[PDB]
Swiss-Prot record, chains A, B, C, D, E, F:
<keyword id="KW-0548">Nucleotidyltransferase</keyword>
<keyword id="KW-0547">Nucleotide-binding</keyword>
<keyword id="KW-0808">Transferase</keyword>
<dbReference type="InterPro" id="IPR004821">
    <property type="entry name" value="Cyt_trans-like"/>
</dbReference>
<comment type="function">
    <text>Reversibly transfers an adenylyl group from ATP to 4'-phosphopantetheine, yielding dephospho-CoA (dPCoA) and pyrophosphate.</text>
</comment>
<keyword id="KW-0173">Coenzyme A biosynthesis</keyword>
<dbReference type="GO" id="GO:0005524">
    <property type="term" value="F:ATP binding"/>
</dbReference>
<feature type="binding site">
    <location>
        <position position="87"/>
    </location>
    <ligand>
        <name>substrate</name>
    </ligand>
</feature>
<feature type="binding site">
    <location>
        <begin position="88"/>
        <end position="90"/>
    </location>
    <ligand>
        <name>ATP</name>
    </ligand>
</feature>
<feature type="site" description="Transition state stabilizer">
    <location>
        <position position="17"/>
    </location>
</feature>
<feature type="binding site">
    <location>
        <begin position="9"/>
        <end position="10"/>
    </location>
    <ligand>
        <name>ATP</name>
    </ligand>
</feature>
<feature type="binding site">
    <location>
        <begin position="122"/>
        <end position="128"/>
    </location>
    <ligand>
        <name>ATP</name>
    </ligand>
</feature>
<feature type="binding site">
    <location>
        <position position="9"/>
    </location>
    <ligand>
        <name>substrate</name>
    </ligand>
</feature>
<feature type="binding site">
    <location>
        <position position="41"/>
    </location>
    <ligand>
        <name>substrate</name>
    </ligand>
</feature>
<dbReference type="GO" id="GO:0004595">
    <property type="term" value="F:pantetheine-phosphate adenylyltransferase activity"/>
</dbReference>
<dbReference type="Pfam" id="PF01467">
    <property type="entry name" value="CTP_transf_like"/>
</dbReference>
<comment type="pathway">
    <text>Cofactor biosynthesis; coenzyme A biosynthesis; CoA from (R)-pantothenate: step 4/5.</text>
</comment>
Amino acid sequence: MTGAVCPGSFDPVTLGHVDIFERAAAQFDEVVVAILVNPAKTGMFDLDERIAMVKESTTHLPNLRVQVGHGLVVDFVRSCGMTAIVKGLRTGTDFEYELQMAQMNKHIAGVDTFFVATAPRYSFVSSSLAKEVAMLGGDVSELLPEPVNRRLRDRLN
Amino acid sequence: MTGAVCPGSFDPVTLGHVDIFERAAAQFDEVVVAILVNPAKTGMFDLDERIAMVKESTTHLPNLRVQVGHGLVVDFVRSCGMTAIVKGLRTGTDFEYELQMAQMNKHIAGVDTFFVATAPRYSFVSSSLAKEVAMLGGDVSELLPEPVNRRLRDRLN
Amino acid sequence: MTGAVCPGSFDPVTLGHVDIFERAAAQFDEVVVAILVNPAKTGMFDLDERIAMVKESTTHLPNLRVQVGHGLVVDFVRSCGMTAIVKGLRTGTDFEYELQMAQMNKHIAGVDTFFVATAPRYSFVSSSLAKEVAMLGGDVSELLPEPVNRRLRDRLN
Amino acid sequence: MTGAVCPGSFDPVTLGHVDIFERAAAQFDEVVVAILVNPAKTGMFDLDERIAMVKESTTHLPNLRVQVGHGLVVDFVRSCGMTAIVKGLRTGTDFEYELQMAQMNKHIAGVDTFFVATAPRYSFVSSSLAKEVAMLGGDVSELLPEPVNRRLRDRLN
Amino acid sequence: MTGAVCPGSFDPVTLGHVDIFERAAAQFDEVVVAILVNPAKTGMFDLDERIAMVKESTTHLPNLRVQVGHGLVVDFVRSCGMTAIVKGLRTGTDFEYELQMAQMNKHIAGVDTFFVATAPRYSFVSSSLAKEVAMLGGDVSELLPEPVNRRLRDRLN
Amino acid sequence: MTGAVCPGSFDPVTLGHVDIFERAAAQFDEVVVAILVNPAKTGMFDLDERIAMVKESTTHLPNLRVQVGHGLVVDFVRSCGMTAIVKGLRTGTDFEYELQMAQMNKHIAGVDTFFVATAPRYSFVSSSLAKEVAMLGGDVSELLPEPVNRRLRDRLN
């Protein structure tokens, strides 16, 4: 009867995220990656692209599924019939804020949040920094799954 | 001859703020809650509303008064004839930044800043997160004074 | 096929620990509380006492069991046929060190470590501080399970 | 009816401590410096010396007095008829631990703890580091009051 | 064969920055201050002004030169024939983010980043806070070089 | 005219230390690894062993030399005719304390301290944790140079 949700904007998903997905998948019967929507623009890839990149990057995880999140994460979590959120912590993570949200979430919906440190090698990657560097000409291909690099290379060019 | 100022945007005031007001009120002869103004919009409640919510939430503190702050906090503080600022520290607080401002304030006006940890139970509440959650349908009534919940419920609906 | 280990010296177990036990128990099929041994003395309660206090404080958690840990936590974890460690994070937690150990543990045994924030109300309790305060005459009964208070009161007197 | 206690081992008192004493003295009607005792040795100066150094370094603060602390700080505080503790925060301060103690102290005795950042120039001085450096031949005279340097020079030699 | 780059927006340069420039200049044969450009506006001083203020504030550092940075800092660094970046760390510094960028930069270009703590006295100054305070009427002249105060006074008025 | 000192107990030296040595060696004309002495015991390897392990692990760094440190690091630094200390920062590093020492060192001897983040892969290794794990049977060979593993294996057995 176990399951966990991994929420995020995944714009785009990185190998740090995938590492977290793999570890959650190894510890819970079912994992749902919840891709949060963007009110307008300001994001790099649209929802369909984000979903595709995540699905394409998680074919080796049979007990994991991708779905679009709407509203409060806790509402999505309880709609999935779960009470756990799994989030990775890495270099640049505003972990103080993650703590605030975790307790707020416990308070309003009884939902637990389990944190896990990302692998050392993916500790400095973030969707935001990967995009910034990629935009300015830097090669971040070793920090992103190939389905993402493929699309990232195409966006540019 | 003692007094302290508790500055903030209080949009809206939370029970974490009230806890700080109560503790400052117990240690200083006079406490002044300074509500900072907003250059345009982007805030949820207007100044009059913010003032009302604070006053209505502090009727049990006779040595406390609410006033609108303008310009540098230190200028307001010295205008009140005081040299102390009391700020609460809680989960999500950018305490590194609070330290920078405290020393900058000491440097330019000789004004001291005393920090106090918020009660554990109100440690994850912030005006910003309360609004975000409230906006998306979450019930944060147990973290805000009733004068605020009353108005928050009315804003929605 | 899920299980997690909650390692510690639990000298004595606090309500913060119990909160963590409850949350791990709600998310994993099986939870094992691993009480680490002490090379000589310097601890307040002996192993038998620690075990008893934990068992007596966890009767409401059927899928949880208490066992004595020996050697590396990861060796104990794999001996239990698991690959997950669940640890609570609270005020005073040397979380930077917990991160170091988590990654070291992942590196040497492939064991994952999931962290969870303790409830706000139990955020300032630690076995060490509870003992220090208790020793000097302070009443920490509201932060410890009754099976522990009973024994703590008896130790003194 | 206001007063605050500044607890510590003050072995020896530094200019960072004096800065805190001065600021507490400017904001509270009465300030009491509570010098905590040492169970045996391991300290550099004995109680009488510590008291003397503090008194000699605070002659310019008429509303401040030095007394020897025994037991829990909160018990000392309430014995002084106060409910406030003032502590300075500086480089090397285990502020996470100070937060734990502040809340524990609030919990057991209703005593408030107000923190203040030390002046930038005294931010890296601590009794411990001053002694370590002094022991190995370093000159830390600019970070300690003269009554302390006088005694420190005499200890050596 | 040694050299280091000190990148930043320097809008405007502060005495904290100058302290870092001086220390880098004392340890490396050649130092290049790289002033990053601003995509549109939102900055206070234009590029020419920023360059002038830095040059005027560094006449005592013969082995230092000012140049305008474009694109990734690492690309600028390697274009200067160097592999080191020197950045100061101070109160308000998002050092967690600096760590992320340092490792990202090492990863993509093999460029090292050396951090140095700013002098205690300039630990609370930042271009942003200096401007904010200056804008509201505060005197921050003791935290900025005279070439900057001259221009800052003229901007206002 | 450039040089830097890398001080430490190196008991034993790890690959994280070597990474720092390599980076310092690439940026300074001369690097001196200063092995600090131990007042009595409590250390695992004796001075001669520590020196040997460091020398054997740094044969690829021609501009680096190993020497035994005595007294204050700053005194050793100035005796080497240098004014720079290079230290690595990693997971578990008490960086708040490193900041205190850096400023104390600047204050008493004018010596600068440059910090560098360790490579992500060696971010969780420390001499202390490597020994603790090694002692209890864990294999930390991938985090230590072979000259150290050779000796570590021999110590045990």
